[PDB]
Amino acid sequence: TGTNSESDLSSIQDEIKSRLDEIDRVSGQTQFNGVNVLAKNGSMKIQVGA
Amino acid sequence: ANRFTSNIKGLTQAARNANDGISVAQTTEGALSEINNNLQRVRELTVQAT
Which family does it belong to (chain A)? Predict the structure, then answer.
């Protein structure tokens, strides 16, 4: 919006980059059973037969 | 009569010998059953591991 001044955009961008860094942290730290699920493309194979 | 006595003693000894085969067979069957149980558990472990 054109009404916002430069410091307003600075605060907005600070919060935006904070939340983007939080998203990256959630991606990195969230690990299951020694597997970082949201950190690399892959596939899982579950034996559902005999 | 002497020949009949020979046959009687021979057949009695033959039956006594025959029982030993049943004994051996039962012992080996028990051992095979234990091996079967071990194999079954190993198969379950592989199903869990794959």
Answer: Belongs to the bacterial flagellin family.
